[PDB]
């Protein structure tokens, strides 16, 4: 009984995971030790909720082991149950009073539960206990708890002047024992500002600047404290002075560039900023002034064009090679940004002609040729650049994308598989998220996705030696699709691991004494599944998952009468929607802010799993931000209305009665063209994905879509159709 449990933990502790599980699984069908063992096992296997239940049970069965409360506080913190972690922290504190860690962790739990005064008192009581000249190895932790206490008093103070004045006296008292001086000074200045004590603040901002004169943020806060934020004459004089204190730093040189209006003065400061960078051969020179092109294009462009063309005209190409090539490089970017591509090419060619060993020049020239519509030449140039550094991930990916745009399939495949030549692994590592960064992986997912669509079309054409070719292609279609899905699926693993890495810190930060950093970690962990790269991977993978679902239903209707290294298993799934949810979508949806929530995604996800009242909620919330005349809105509503006619009966009713209050707002396309117009590309694309459902006239729909793309270059239009219409035209297999 207890034996079966400990048998499992042993088994897991060895590595026989499957046998461990059955041993534990039927052990369930008790002892304090038994509950403890299972709590441990469930933690080890990331069943934190289950682990918490079993730990609580160990106690409720007369466990004498007080270390269980520490296990609980950790687990409860990890899953976000801070109400119960507080109880655990209090219990553990009572049994192990002699360690400051347990005081700090109790205070942190009180703070998180909104018990700020209690948290303050907890910290203050230990503070008093530790007046007896704290030893050198305890001074760091002590400094951190003093500042943490000030954090809590600062928050509680809000805008109250008396309270703020007290937070400041406390701040001043603790200063000699606080070693986080940046932290303390930044807090001091903020308080000063909130007290209306601007001269005091400016002194602190000047102190922060002198400690790090390369931090733009201190300079902007200084301006506000001096009350000259709108004063060009005084700002000019201020930065001129700060430039004499800090002549090697960018903010005094750069900030006047954002506000000066006098042409001669601005020209001079632009010259002083840019020309020394060109003369040093700084590759980033243009990137450094790009924000000026972005925010002051018409004013700064002509000035810098003149400034840098003049500078160039004075350079000897042979005896001033470094200024010459990096000045030509700047001018190439300058005219590229201005969308003058022939001139951009001239300047990059001059740099390349002089010095062909620099990768930067191939990268820039390939981009310029892309803009000139010369896709094979652009890919060729980038490929030359790739020979200069064959292990660079950025250029490897970019080269693949360019050959794909040039429809050079063989070269794309060759370059794409360079780092993964053996067993789809990089240097013995199967799981790419353990060795490559997320961008390399998503770029590969996209490239394979595109390689997959290419084979997909070749198959369609073969359908209309040959049986061998079809066999070759059917096989490449599976391989490229699997690789795309496998690449996308590596991404969530990055972020799952980060979330789970938190676990040891719920106690380690307490022991190290970094409660402020700990709280930032908690906010961070609550946002992991909303990062740009995570969201990008999720939405791009979603089309593979939606299509495995959609195409299976298609093939099913089609045959109604009829008688691992490349991710093959992933693409044969019969639960693609559940796979998307567990691997990508649930964690994102659990964390995303409502003002960041993508309601088109939510609608289309819940549509395919039948949850038609979530569909309605998504449609409604969408309108509340984007209007009821938006093409996308009309499209979702139409599809939802049709759904109320294959879905659950007792819920088609619910939606209908929920839709009863859209009564004011049969050929459904013509209704669409008349109530919403034919200009909303996203609205048209949405109809296209459900056109055989509504139904929606596909020929007329495609024409509207193609009209709305009339603006774009012909080759580009093709690529749009391939990505946005094709996959919904013909089912895989």
């Amino acid at each position: 009984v207890d034996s079966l449990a400990l048998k499992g933990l042993d088994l897991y502790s060895v590595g026989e995971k499957d046998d461990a599980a059955s041993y534990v699984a039927n052990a369930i069908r008790a002892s304090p030790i038994c509950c403890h063992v299972l709590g441990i096992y469930m933690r080890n296997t990331k069943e934190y909720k289950e682990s918490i239940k079993w730990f609580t049970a160990a106690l409720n069965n007369g466990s004498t082991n007080k270390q269980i409360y520490r296990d609980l506080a950790t687990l409860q913190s990890q899953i976000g149950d801070f109400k119960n972690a507080l109880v655990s922290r209090k219990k553990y504190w009572e049994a192990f009073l002699g360690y400051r860690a347990n005081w700090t962790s109790l205070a942190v739990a009180q703070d998180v539960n909104g018990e700020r005064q209690q948290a303050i008192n907890t910290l203050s009581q230990f503070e008093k206990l530790a007046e007896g000249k704290i030893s050198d190895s305890e001074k760091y932790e002590h400094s951190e708890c003093l500042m943490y206490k000030n954090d809590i008093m600062y928050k509680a103070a809000s805008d109250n002047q008396d309270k703020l004045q007290n937070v400041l006296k406390h701040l001043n008292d603790i200063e000699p024992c606080v070693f986080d001086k940046f932290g303390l000074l930044e807090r001091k200045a903020t308080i000063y500002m909130k007290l209306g004590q601007l001269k005091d603040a400016s002194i602190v901002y000047r102190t922060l600047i002198k400690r790090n004169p390369d931090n733009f943020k201190y300079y902007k806060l200084l301006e506000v404290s001096l009350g000259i934020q709108g004063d060009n004459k005084l700002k000019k004089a201020l930065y001129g002075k700060l430039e004499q204190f800090y002549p090697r730093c960018e903010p005094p040189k750069f900030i006047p560039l954002t506000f000066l209006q006098d042409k001669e003065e601005l020209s001079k400061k632009l010259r002083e900023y840019v020309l020394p960078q060109l003369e040093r051969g700084v590759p980033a020179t243009f990137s450094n002034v790009k924000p000026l092109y972005q925010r002051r294009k018409s004013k700064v462009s002509p000035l810098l064009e003149k400034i840098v063309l003049d500078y160039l005209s004075g350079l000897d190409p042979t005896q001033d090679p470094i200024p010459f090539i990096w000045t030509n490089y700047y001018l190439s970017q300058h005219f590229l940004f201005l969308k003058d591509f022939p001139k951009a090419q001239e300047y990059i060619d001059a740099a390349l002609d002089h010095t062909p060993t620099l990768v930067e020049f191939y990268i820039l020239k390939a981009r310029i040729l892309k803009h000139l519509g010369l896709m094979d030449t652009a890919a060729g140039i980038l490929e030359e650049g790739r020979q200069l550094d064959l292990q660079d991930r950025f250029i490897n990916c970019k080269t693949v994308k360019y050959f794909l745009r040039a429809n050079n399939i063989d070269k794309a495949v060759e370059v794409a598989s360079l780092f993964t030549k053996n067993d789809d692994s990089v240097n013995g590592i199967k799981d790419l998220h353990l060795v490559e960064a997320s961008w390399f992986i998503v770029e590969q997912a996209e490239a394979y996705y595109r390689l997959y669509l290419d084979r997909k079309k070749k198959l369609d054409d073969l359908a209309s030696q040959i049986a061998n070719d079809i066999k070759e292609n059917q096989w490449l279609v599976r391989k490229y699709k699997g690789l795309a899905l496998k690449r996308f699926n590596a991404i969530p693993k990055f972020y799952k691991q980060f979330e789970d890495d938190q676990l040891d810190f719920h106690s380690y930060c307490m022991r190290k004494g970094t409660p402020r950093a700990y709280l930032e970690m908690l906010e961070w962990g609550k946002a992991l599944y909303t990062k740009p790269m995570y969201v990008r991977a999720m939405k791009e993978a979603s089309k593979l998952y939606f299509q495995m679902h959609d195409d299976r239903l298609k093939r099913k209707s089609d045959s109604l009468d009829e008688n691992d290294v490349f991710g093959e298993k992933l693409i044969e799934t019969s639960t693609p929607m559940e796979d998307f949810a567990t691997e990508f979508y649930n964690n994102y949806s659990m964390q995303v802010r409502e003002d960041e929530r993508d309601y088109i995604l939510d609608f289309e996800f819940n549509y395919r799993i039948g949850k038609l009242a979530l569909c309605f909620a998504s449609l409604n919330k969408f309108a509340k931000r984007f209007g009821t005349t938006s093409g996308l809105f009309g499209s979702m509503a139409i599809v939802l209305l049709h759904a109320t006619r294959p879905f659950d009966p007792i819920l088609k009713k619910v939606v209908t009665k929920s839709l009863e209050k859209e009564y004011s707002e049969f050929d459904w396309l013509n209704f669409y063209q008349e109530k919403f117009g034919k200009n909303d590309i996203n609205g048209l694309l949405f109809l296209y994905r459900y056109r055989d459902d509504v139904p929606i006239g596909s020929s007329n729909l495609k024409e509207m879509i193609i009209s709305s793309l009339s603006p774009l270059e012909p080759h580009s239009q093709n690529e749009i159709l391939q990505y946005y219409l094709y996959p919904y035209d013909v089912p895989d297999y």
Partner: protein
């Protein structure tokens, strides 16, 4: 331009960007959390603006369709701070208190911008101020000129010795150490290097400026 500031936990995912690594060991991520949550005042970053710090591509805000056309899209709908360098720092925790540069990294395209130097000066000062570190030691391979120059010359590390055949390929190492003193590490000490006014922090800066302008 470039911005220099203290690292936070929000920076650690950005540190993995392949543009910041010569050889990619992405399993170091928990080790990075561990630094930032153990010595939260010791590490610094250099940044420019971005939409996704994890995206290695020079992302042009004024040309989106080229991204969609590259397959960066969901097949369904149409149309922050990147690190250009960082220094990851710890106290030795395995003995006078001493600090250790776990990792110093700058994008090659951001060469000749003083970034490694600015980052190291902040880190050295922090090690002394926050942790009362007494020194920082490190070894540099004989052929690594950029690193030798940075530590020995720019940052004035002392060369204790040449460790002969330190490396498996037979290369010697320069064993270096910098004794840390707060008055010597003050960032204002280096504001006029290789080229002298300073803010006294007591004067009325704006007033003094107005009066100086009155002269001429």
């Amino acid at each position: 331009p470039i911005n220099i500031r203290r690292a936070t936990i929000n920076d650690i995912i950005c540190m993995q960007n392949a543009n910041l690594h010569n050889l990619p060991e992405n399993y170091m991520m928990k080790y990075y959390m561990y630094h930032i949550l153990s010595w939260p005042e010791a590490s610094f970053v250099a940044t420019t603006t971005t939409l996704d710090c994890e995206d290695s591509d020079e992302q042009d805000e004024n040309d989106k369709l080229e991204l969609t056309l590259d397959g960066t899209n969901d097949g369904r709908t149409i149309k922050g701070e990147k690190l250009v360098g960082y220094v990851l720092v710890k106290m030795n925790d395995d003995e006078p208190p001493n600090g250790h540069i776990t990792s110093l990294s700058v994008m090659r395209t951001y060469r000749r911008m003083g970034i490694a130097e600015n980052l190291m000066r902040q880190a050295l000062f922090a090690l002394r101020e926050v942790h009362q570190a007494e020194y920082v030691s490190l070894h540099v391979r004989q052929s690594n000129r950029a690193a030798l120059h940075l530590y020995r010359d720019t940052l004035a590390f002392e060369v204790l010795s040449i460790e002969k055949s330190y490396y498996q390929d037979g290369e010697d190492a320069y064993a270096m150490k910098k004794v840390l003193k707060l008055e010597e590490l003050q960032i204002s000490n280096f504001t006029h290097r290789r080229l002298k006014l300073e803010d006294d922090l007591e004067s009325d800066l704006l007033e003094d400026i107005i009066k100086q302008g009155v002269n001429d």
